[PDB]
């Protein structure tokens, strides 16, 4: 469970 990055 990570923190949402600025891209995908």
């Amino acid at each position, epitope marked *: 469970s990570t923190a*949402p990055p600025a891209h995908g």
Partner: antibody, heavy 117, light 110 residues
Framework: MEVKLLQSGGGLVQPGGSLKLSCAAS????????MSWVRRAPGKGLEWIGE????????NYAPSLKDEFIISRDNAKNTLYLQMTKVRSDDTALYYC?????????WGQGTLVTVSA | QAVVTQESALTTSPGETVTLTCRSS?????????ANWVQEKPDHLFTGLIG???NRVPGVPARFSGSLIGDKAALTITGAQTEDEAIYFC?????????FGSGTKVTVLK
């Protein structure tokens, strides 16, 4: 705890020198955050240096600066490292460490690097 | 590689609505560019506003909107306040790297 990113890095270096900046996190599970390095030049605007995943499996760099900067992290120490090798005059800038949360969420205070012989 | 372009500057009044654009030289700005909007207030104070085109950083007021207008990515400040007076940098993701824009000096008349 409140999120704080505390940078520690050199100041003055001469052309051809090397420096290693550190960014210690306190207030977040650093092990589950993407990290990134950006910089702000005196005249220029923001410039993206690079980013690194929580497990360090994928490290992305700006194509222009792939050979000058080396991004790493130690999740045990909750620390992010940027290594600048063989610098140039145009590297004089404020270097910032950013943590992603849907965007450029949490920032450090910035470290000044002055390159001059 | 690519050049990201946004307005040099904009001037607005408190309570009004302003819209900044972000242009890609490769073509139209799609959602696969994951537009990011970051603000720099005086004394080099950086704050993340928008990422992934539409997603606000948790804690950012809702007057900051991220959208796509035609070919470009867009940041909309609806009912701007004097504290929104800052330089707004746009950033576009090109598969493996971000490219930042020149910045837009937005002015809210104090």
């Amino acid at each position: 705890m409140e999120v704080k990113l505390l940078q520690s890095g050199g100041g003055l270096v001469q052309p051809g020198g090397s420096l290693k900046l550190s960014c210690a996190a306190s207030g977040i599970d650093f092990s589950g955050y993407w990290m990134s390095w950006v910089r702000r030049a005196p005249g220029k605007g923001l410039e993206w240096i690079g980013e690194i995943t929580p497990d360090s499996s994928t490290i992305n760099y700006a194509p222009s600066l792939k050979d000058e900067f080396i991004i790493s992290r130690d999740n045990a120490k909750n620390t992010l490292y940027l290594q600048m090798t063989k610098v140039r005059s145009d590297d004089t800038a404020l270097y910032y460490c950013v943590s992603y949360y849907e965007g450029f969420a949490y920032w450090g205070q910035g470290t000044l690097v002055t390159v001059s012989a | 590689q690519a050049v990201v372009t946004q307005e040099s500057a904009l001037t607005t009044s408190p309570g009004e609505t302003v819209t900044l654009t972000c242009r890609s030289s490769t073509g139209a700005v799609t959602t696969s560019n994951y537009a990011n909007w970051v603000q720099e207030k005086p004394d080099h104070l950086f704050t993340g506003l928008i990422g992934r085109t539409n997603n606000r950083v948790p804690g950012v007021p809702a007057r900051f909107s991220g959208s796509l207008i035609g070919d470009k990515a867009a940041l909309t400040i609806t009912g701007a306040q004097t504290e929104d007076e800052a330089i707004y940098f746009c950033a576009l993701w090109y598969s493996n790297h971000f490219i930042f824009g020149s910045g837009t000096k937005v002015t809210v008349l104090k």
